[PDB]
Structures are given as C-alpha cells and as structure tokens.
C-alpha cells in the first residue's frame, strides 16, 4: 500500500528540481518563476529560501561545499549562508530569450543541464531553441546537441553506460550510450513514447533496480518505465495535475518526493486541487532510489 | 465519403506549389530540386515540364499572360512557350545560399513569397536566414520581416482582412490583420499549434467556408483548421508521408490536390510507398476552394 501526502504546501508557481541532501536529511527544490531556491529539513520541517535575480531552474550538490544552480543561462555556485552566487559559465549568449531548464550532476560530477526558449505562451510560439550542456570540474562547458524544445528530466543507468533524457515536446524518453570517463554521449534512441493521458513528460529519476520514474505534466501522475523492455510498469496518480518532477529521498532512499506547479491553473481547478504547487511525499512504492551525484568543481 | 487518387505517379524529388489553372483544366506545380515547372493536363493525363537554371519553388498565373515564378532568390516572369525566365526582381542578395520557398498571389494581384537558407546533405541548415516579401504590380518588392526558418504556406480570409502564414520550423499557423488596399499586415498571432504526430506544417489554402487546409510534411496528412476557434476539424490521411502542399481545383474547386516529396527517404520506405513524390486528388470533402489570384504586374 501507497501513502501520498503533501509534506509542504508551498504553493509554488512552478516547483522543480527535487534533490535529496542525505548528509542533513533535507530536500532542495526550486520555484522557477518565483526565482527561489528552497531547502526543506525533513526533521525540523523548516524551509529556508533564497531569491535569485533570474529564473532558477535546477539545483544540485557541490562536493567542495554549498550548492550549484542554473540561474537564467548561467551555471552558478551558491553560498547558501551568504545568499551569494558566483557565475561558473554562461551558454546560449546568442539567444535573446532563453533559460536553463532541467539539470542534474553525472556519475563523474559533471553538472548536465539544458535550455529552452522562455515561454508561457504556448500556442502562440516556438522552438527548438534549446541545447543540452555539461559543466565540467574545470569549470569548462560542452554543448552536446541543439534543436531542443524543453530540456527536461535526465538520469543515468546504474552501471554508468547509458544516459536517459527527455525533451518534453518530443513526448518520448530517449537513451544514449554514455562514456563515464569522458562524458561523451552517442546513438540517441527512443526508449518510451508517452501515451496521450500521460500528457507532457517532465522530470525523471532512476531507481535502485534501474527503472525510470517520469513526472507527467498536466498528467497528475508519475509513471515507472523499464528502459530495457520499452514498457510502462506502473502509474501512481497524485491529487494534483501539474506534477513536474520527482526524486527518491528519506531513509534508505525509500520515499519519493514530487514537485508540482500552481501556475496556469484557473479558479475552479485551484478550488479542488488546493495543494497545487506543494511538495508531495509518496511512501510504500516498494522500491528505493539512489543518491544524487555532487558537482566536482 | 473521401476518395483519394494518385492522379500522377510523378515521383517528384519535392513536388510543391500546386496551382489550378482552370482555363486549360491543368494543375501547375514545381519540383524544387529538379528545378522544374510542371503542368498536368487533367484531361489527357500528360505532364509537360520546363527546366529552369536555379531551383523553382513556386509558380503563379500572370494576369497579362504566361506565368510568374520564384527561381533561386528571384521573382521571374515565365513565358511557357519559349522556356526562359525574365528577371523582374531579386531579394536576399547578401545571402549567398538563400532560395525562395512558398509564394501565392494576393486578392489584389501581389505575389507574396518568402525565402529560407538552402539546405545540406541535402538539404538542411541554418537557420533564421529567411524573410517574407511581396512583389507589387509595379515590380517593386516590399519586405515584411525576417529571422524566418522556412517561409511556407500562405492564404487570405474571404473578407480579405486576414493573412494566414506558415513558418514550418515555427510548428504554428499564424494570423496577421491584413489590409487589402495597401497589402499591409499587423498583429501577428498563433491561430493553431501542430501536435507531435502532425509533424511540420508546410503549404496551405483557405476553403469557401474560411477554414484552412494544411499539409503536414512527414505527417502523411492534410488537417483542416478553424482559424477562429483554433481547433482541428478533420484529418485526411494519405498513402505517402511527405505531403508538402495543397490547393483546390477540378470543376468549381470541388476537389483538392496534394503534392508530396520523395527526397530524404531510404530504399525500403520508397518500396512501402510506391507513390512517393506523386500528385493525389481528394474528392468528397464537402467544401469547395477558391480560384487562384493572377499577378497584376
Ligand atoms: Zn521540468
Ligand atoms: Zn512548401
């Protein structure tokens, strides 16, 4: 049996980028259009919040201390206590209107993230403006590929030989060969195409059996896929439609934390999804996840 | 009911710009990379073709006689009985790889056509290189706006107050307010957004109810769109994937003609679509089209 609970009714405009900090039993996440980074202590229940000067799309662990975030079209290191960010690298300078979206650290401590055109407009507009990036330990940047609509969930297989990636308007989870030692990706192929009711695929993580959990935007669900068989294994429905992301955390990585968005709802949807934008905890999935990697620069 | 016929197994590299010439009961079209203007006699069933010296991307009737056509980055007059073009105007002189794409005459005798960067491999690059133009009856070019990808299908509403325009890599059918007397457009807005499955929006033609028909390049289909409600009204699927463009012809515009492309297909997909690059005729739609305008310069 499954328990779904709102642990923190944060009403985020757009909650994203859940990451489990095991050393302090905290969850981090972002609220993208609110430009916030948040850190929620699972023991005290207290949340702290830093507000940045541009959309903050993702946040990850930095092994030397503090955190890394993608703010606007920059990779930045964050000194949480000083409420100070230092710019590590910039991308997409040629684009007048981009941001980072989803990002996540390698098995080798490289901070992967891509971009997208900024939009809340959708159905008056356009595309293919994104590209996938990685920030190496030496603070150098690689562009993997362009023509990306919305850079979204991403992860890596337990044996470090395959990269999983979602570009959301593709409606497909893709897989690449990944070289751990160099961070090269090849042989892009589709491993799962969403069903319609699955709506927009968004955030993703891998679990300790190597299956994939995809948050489904407008979907009110997260879906478990086998990437080696090509099939859906399970659907867990949430009391909110605008599920964005998910990760594993809590004791032994046995709980799932899920982000969602309160933005773009109307009065009558807010009325009966009153916890929209909250953080949900799902217990009793009967699977554990794995620990995130920490940026190496 | 819908009835589909491959009226001509032309195998066009890329067949485009269908135009019904009702005084000879013929369909004019182009084959862009073969650099051919084409004319199929719907009665004898035979196709005549003239070879130009640069890719021909559109053709239109000329009020005073013969044809106009866009050949490379040039608006040309075409006398079909000799077979050479007389340049009337050049655009994009500073872009030494641009070509015109799609073009159609105004309810007022102005030849609209926009350009794109010619592509590779072959072809395919890079990007925002295009602009939208309109040759006036005095042989002077107006320009309109740039950073287009693939200037594609275009038509006018039946009140002559709305210009509809497709830029392919925009996956959006757009509308502008349009002013007959001056050819001025303004208030560009998305009236429709393509679903993953519909692929890339290519040519298009309004019907006598004011709906819009758009050929979905790699969607093997034309979809009929309500500009005012922004919803898809029906899908007509086709024997072949690279449907490029569409127009109304046959007696009083009661039949629809779909062009297609066979360039960019592998040896075994050609063998599943024996009719890639042909001309299809669809009867049974319930609506008629409207006649083409003739160029008044
Ligand atoms: Zn996301
Ligand atoms: Zn076209």
Give the arrangement of secondary structure elements.
Two copies of one chain form a homodimer.
Chain A: E1 3-8, E2 15-21, E3 26-31, E4 36-41, E5 47-51, E6 56-61, E7 67-71, E8 74-79, E9 84-90, E10 98-105, E11 111-117, E12 130-135, E13 141-148, E14 151-156, E15 162-167, E16 172-178, E17 185-193, E18 200-206, E19 212-217, E20 221-225, E21 232-237, E22 243-249, E23 255-260, H1 267-272, E24 279-283
Antiparallel strand pairs in A: 1-24, 2-3, 3-4, 4-5, 6-7, 7-8, 8-9, 10-11, 11-12, 12-13, 14-15, 15-16, 16-17, 18-19, 19-20, 20-21, 22-23, 23-24
The site of one zinc ion has 8 residues of chain A, from strand 10, strand 18 and strand 22.
Provide a brief overview of the structure.
Chains A, B: Its cofactor is Zn(2+); Mn(2+); Ca(2+); Mg(2+). Two copies of one chain form a homodimer. Chain A is an all-beta fold and 297 residues long.
């Amino acid at each position: 049996s499954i328990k779904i609970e709102c642990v923190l009714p944060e009403n985020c405009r757009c909650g994203e980028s859940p990451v489990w900090e095991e050393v302090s039993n905290s969850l981090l996440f972002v609220d993208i259009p609110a430009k916030k980074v948040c850190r929620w202590d699972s023991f005290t229940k207290q949340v702290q919040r830093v507000t940045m000067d541009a959309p903050v799309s993702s946040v990850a662990l930095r092994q030397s201390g503090g955190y890394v975030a993608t703010i606007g079209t920059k990779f930045c290191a964050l000194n949480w206590k000083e409420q100070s960010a230092v710019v590590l690298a910039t991308v997409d300078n040629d684009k007048k209107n981009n941001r980072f979206n989803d990002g996540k650290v390698d098995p080798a401590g490289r901070y992967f993230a891509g971009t997208m055109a900024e939009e809340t407009a959708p159905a008056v507009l356009e595309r293919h403006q994104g590209a996938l990036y990685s920030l190496f330990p030496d603070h150098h940047v690689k562009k993997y590929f362009d023509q990306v609509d919305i850079s979204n969930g991403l992860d890596w297989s337990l044996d470090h030989k395959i990269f999983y990636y979602i570009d959301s308007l593709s409606y497909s989870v893709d897989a690449f060969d990944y070289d751990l030692q160099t961070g090269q990706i090849s042989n892009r192929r589709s491993v799962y195409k969403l069903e319609k009711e699955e709506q927009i695929p968004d955030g993703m993580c891998i679990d300790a059996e190597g299956k994939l959990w995809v948050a489904c935007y407008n979907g009110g669900r997260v879906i478990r896929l086998d990437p080696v068989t090509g099939k859906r294994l399970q659907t867990v429905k949430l009391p909110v439609d605008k599920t964005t992301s998910c990760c594993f955390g809590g004791k032994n990585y046995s709980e799932m934390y899920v982000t969602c968005a309160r933005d773009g709802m109307d009065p009558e949807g807010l009325l009966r999804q009153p916890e929209a934008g909250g953080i949900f905890k799902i217990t009793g999935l009967g699977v554990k996840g794995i620990a995130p990697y920490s940026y190496a620069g």
